[PDB]
Ligand binder design. Sequence first.
Ligand SMILES: O=P(O)(O)OCCNS(=O)(=O)c1ccc(OC(F)(F)F)cc1
Ligand SMILES: O=P(O)(O)OCCNS(=O)(=O)c1ccc(OC(F)(F)F)cc1
Ligand SMILES: C=C(/N=C/c1c(COP(=O)(O)O)cnc(C)c1O)C(=O)O
Ligand SMILES: C=C(/N=C/c1c(COP(=O)(O)O)cnc(C)c1O)C(=O)O
Ligand SMILES: [Cl-]
Ligand SMILES: [Cl-]
Ligand SMILES: [Cs+]
Ligand SMILES: [Cs+]
Ligand SMILES: [Cs+]
Ligand SMILES: [Cs+]
Lengths: 268, 268, 395, 395
Amino acid sequence: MERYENLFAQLNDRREGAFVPFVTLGDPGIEQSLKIIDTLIDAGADALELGVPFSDPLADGPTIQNANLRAFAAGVTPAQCFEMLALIREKHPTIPIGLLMYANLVFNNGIDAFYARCEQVGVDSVLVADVPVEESAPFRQAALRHNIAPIFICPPNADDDLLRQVASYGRGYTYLLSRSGVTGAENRGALPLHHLIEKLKEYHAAPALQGFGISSPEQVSAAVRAGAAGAISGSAIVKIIEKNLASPKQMLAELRSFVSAMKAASRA
Amino acid sequence: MERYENLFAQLNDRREGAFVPFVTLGDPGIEQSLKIIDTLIDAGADALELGVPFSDPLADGPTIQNANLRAFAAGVTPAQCFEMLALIREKHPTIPIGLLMYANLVFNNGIDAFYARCEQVGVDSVLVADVPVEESAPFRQAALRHNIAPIFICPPNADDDLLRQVASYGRGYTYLLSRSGVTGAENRGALPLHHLIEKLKEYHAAPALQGFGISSPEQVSAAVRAGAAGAISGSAIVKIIEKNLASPKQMLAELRSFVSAMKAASRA
Amino acid sequence: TTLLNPYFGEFGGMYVPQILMPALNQLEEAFVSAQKDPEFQAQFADLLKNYAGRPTALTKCQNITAGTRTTLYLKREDLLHGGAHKTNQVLGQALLAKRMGKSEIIAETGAGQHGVASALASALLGLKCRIYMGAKDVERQSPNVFRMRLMGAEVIPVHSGSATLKDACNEALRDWSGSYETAHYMLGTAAGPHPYPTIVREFQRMIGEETKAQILDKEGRLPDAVIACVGGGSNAIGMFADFINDTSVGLIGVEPGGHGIETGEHGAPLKHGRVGIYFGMKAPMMQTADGQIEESYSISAGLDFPSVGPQHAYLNSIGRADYVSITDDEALEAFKTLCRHEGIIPALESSHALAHALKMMREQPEKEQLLVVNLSGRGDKDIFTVHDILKARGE
Amino acid sequence: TTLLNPYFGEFGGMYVPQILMPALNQLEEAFVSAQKDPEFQAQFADLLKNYAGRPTALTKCQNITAGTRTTLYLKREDLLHGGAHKTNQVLGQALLAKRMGKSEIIAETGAGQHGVASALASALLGLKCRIYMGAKDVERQSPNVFRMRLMGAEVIPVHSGSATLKDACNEALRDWSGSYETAHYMLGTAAGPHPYPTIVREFQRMIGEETKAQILDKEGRLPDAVIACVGGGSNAIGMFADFINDTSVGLIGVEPGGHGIETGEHGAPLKHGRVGIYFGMKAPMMQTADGQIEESYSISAGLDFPSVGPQHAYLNSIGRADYVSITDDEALEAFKTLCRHEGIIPALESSHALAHALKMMREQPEKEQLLVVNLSGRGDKDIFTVHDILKARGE
Ligand SMILES: O=P(O)(O)OCCNS(=O)(=O)c1ccc(OC(F)(F)F)cc1
Ligand SMILES: O=P(O)(O)OCCNS(=O)(=O)c1ccc(OC(F)(F)F)cc1
Ligand SMILES: C=C(/N=C/c1c(COP(=O)(O)O)cnc(C)c1O)C(=O)O
Ligand SMILES: C=C(/N=C/c1c(COP(=O)(O)O)cnc(C)c1O)C(=O)O
Ligand SMILES: [Cl-]
Ligand SMILES: [Cl-]
Ligand SMILES: [Cs+]
Ligand SMILES: [Cs+]
Ligand SMILES: [Cs+]
Ligand SMILES: [Cs+]
């Protein structure tokens, strides 16, 4: 399908950036996670980035580490995540859905079979966090064979060779990393690097979404004003879940407020 | 003086051996120690061997180690031991009195001065436990200059050279060691070695007293029947003190009984 | 693009977040440069000789082989400064850190021997050292925690997951992905992303080189086999490397069998796991049906890790090296035997290697064989653990 | 009558109960025989090299002397098997025991390093070992108690007197006076009755011999001074012996100052005691006015002894060696400095020697001097003691 291409064309026509929340699938349980995801969409999410719980998430700080653990405590497995994804797609036919995967979960019982499962449930992109472009060949090949966009990362200090490779190999969107380190709301990323945004455009890369440490509307606005197509926020969203575990109605109200304000900032 | 010479001549005329108890001076206090010593004499001791409390008595087992500690707990010093010795001699003009010394107490503030103090209070012999014949020259010279008998040890495995040296250098009595090891009533010495007794007589040594582990009348009798001039018992005596610390009258009654039985055995 | 091959057959690679690729490339370039640099080699040799005390002895152990046809030597890495083989490669990596202009060190440790090595090298060479250690390991290897702290290292307990080596590894890598501009990650085993398996081997290979020279001097011939325990694989590849081309020489690696392979409470992925991608590498690992990483188990903290270095996976695959397992109880017996009969207190890790050598002897006592066991460390760190066990056991 | 001179000037001799004289004579004859016996010398050399790991390194310590004119080397007896210099002479005495047909060993220990050495040698060479240790020392040097027991030694706590080294010595000698037919008393220091001060020196003198060769190689000249701590005197006489005839070379021995000489809580008889007779020898000792032996004190168990070996008393008397003291707090500072700045954890005993070298440097920082400190052991046994102190201190 062409869900990212269609989204970005629509946003361009409206002179808007994307706001893309991240949550862990099944945190804090399957039913509540599905309601959280429906709330994110209703509140104005343009696309979703969804984590499949993994035992050792090496690119994640404590907030998302804890989300993974809550999902495991609820007995969540990749198979259950694919069941959830099928239900989300059935409700929401056009919203781009991206997965945050760790390599072993993709590699486990065959790379091709993984991407085939993604296509069957209607996923649009996969970002494999611990596979750099240098190791990416079998992943990106399988992705494209199954009509999945493979997502690559442009780090702050990316050299020209890497910019060209990311532009060529990726599809859907380019992940523009705010900063070094691991995920986390407290550690605020730098402003989007204009030079990287400009180079990716020069090389006809998929549109850039800035992520890591984006926790406030001002940061979303700054991403778009720097020329990024949008921004991703994970830890800030997940903190609202963590804070409100015993108050699920309050959880959804706070998620709605936050997502709405972050989306409003994408219009700047 | 000639107190050992006179004693042994008297015992020979009566066809008797000597029984010689050992106690630590000032155990368990000065007054009680003096009464203990008077009891030993009244009960039939032929001579005395008296320890001056020393901090590290390396030839003594736990029983006599503990006697030394009791004396220290009562504040006993060598100076107080010399005061006691003067009182004992004043009461008992003919009984041979021998000291068990450790080298440092003799060497401390001058060897000659030590033996001079012994002569002044009326001591007859000094046995320095950690000075072998090989190191004995200044000790035996000072002893003889002050009319004190230096006591030497004949161990079970003594060779001929040692037997000749002990015969030549010693006076008063020769100490015939029952066994290897340290003092102690529980570890019973062997029978007196006939060959050593016979050799010492051949070499005109001072008469032999057997010591270490002699705790019973049968052992005293065996010493004399083997040809020794007598026997020394320490730990067995000191145990009676230790057992009866809260019962001083009972202490003296038990000491009297024991010493009387041990002396009776010397007549065999 | 790399200067050196990141793979050993199918195994190895550089499976890290894209952010860290420049750091790995920089490290590889610095290593290649240093390996050709006589000043670097002279500095490294000087520290090994005059500071760490190489060469280490090769001890013939007569009493434990009495009545058999086995001759057994022990390579005495237990006598190296710090108490284990870990010190060799830390001195080389610390020199690389300085060469790259880095003033901070991050390390992970399980037995605390890599942590002690990292701390001592940092003290000597003027680096600021922080060490992650699983909270379980902080307890069972406590003497090493005290040693690291006295040398001025920061020791950070890790309570997540199994609270053991894998969890410390995870935290170290997370830290490095944010701190690489100023910090060198001094990985302590022959595992992880390229170039670490290569660098660790090259800075540990003096073990086997010395062993070869010593056994030729003492026996006039190569060993029938060399035997080493396998956590991530550093002491074993260090002993093996110089013998790989000596085809007659058996290479035997000993994984921890824990409470028994059949219990699932072990650390033996090379023989009982399956290939996966974790900790920067494609290698055998203990994993669930769905591909979650399983927690390992061993009585010995230094072997308690659910994967293995990719060169060992490769050597196994081609049949050049054979891998076996030894249980906790077998290791404990070997520990006791060496203490009582040779007067050497071995690390519990090294006791696994010794236990397998003792089995080789006892199973076939009239087989003529000349064996070398890599005695990778001394057991000071383990004495409280072992005491408590034999006590609870009624010994 | 003896084959060798039992005295060093006024000091030394054989002040034991007559019962023990044949045992001392037998030991002296066996030593004289062994010293001329090429097979014995080859066996001893083999154990030192291939089992204990000699020669030990001589490490230059650059960081701690920065900004001064002092060059400081450390002789690394901390790297010997067992963790201290004690292992050298135990291997030689164990061989003498076997030569005399004895199958049991009695030893005393304070720091537990002589006890560990005795235990390991007994395990290797097939002797039954019993070790006396003061109950205070059992507590403050506990890691060594665990090591001795794991190696199959019997460890007997001594509760009498100060419950420290002198009390253990007393019990060992008492035992030997009853068990000498079958047991060898493996005295652990250069003290006691002849022939022990001589034998211990001759079986420790490789320390100074190696040091001389190493410093000539590295500096092309002899040291200005060699510095060693002094308990009974073994590590110091081992370092000194080969330099006694090199008149330019200063010999500096460091006694424990404890809480301060003025408090009377110390172990510095050579400079603050007076000559007496105890433990089989005529030597300086801490004693009361009346001649009772005083209890010593040091933070370091291996120095906590109220006397000193007679050869050190002699070398002092003629002015060939100078003796100084270092307090507990000075030793602790040196311990910390070496851990933090050189990455070496020294024994608290050895820290006294290092502290005096650091004072020599700091007092006169523009004095050109080449110094060697004998780093007699490693501080693993001390880490719990030191931690507890810096903790109670608010560090
Ligand atoms: O808002 P934060 O700080 O929690 O960051 C949210 C990120 N969530 S995500 O799925 O985009 C995401 C994207 C990439 C990641 O690692 C990689 F860069 F190495 F590939 C990890 C998570
Ligand atoms: O009856 P026991 O077993 O207590 O022995 C009593 C001994 N008391 S003593 O004063 O004769 C005595 C005699 C000699 C001693 O040591 C030496 F032989 F080395 F010189 C020690 C004590
Ligand atoms: C993991 C650690 N130790 C491992 C170790 C091992 C196992 O690790 P390698 O497989 O990397 O040698 C073997 N022997 C000793 C003495 C060890 O300390 C550590 O000290 O951090
Ligand atoms: C008395 C003991 N140790 C003493 C010792 C000493 C002091 O003893 P000498 O003076 O005999 O070297 C010095 N250094 C170390 C490491 C020591 O262990 C003992 O281990 O029994
Ligand atoms: Cl609610
Ligand atoms: Cl009464
Ligand atoms: Cs054999
Ligand atoms: Cs492992
Ligand atoms: Cs200097
Ligand atoms: Cs001393």
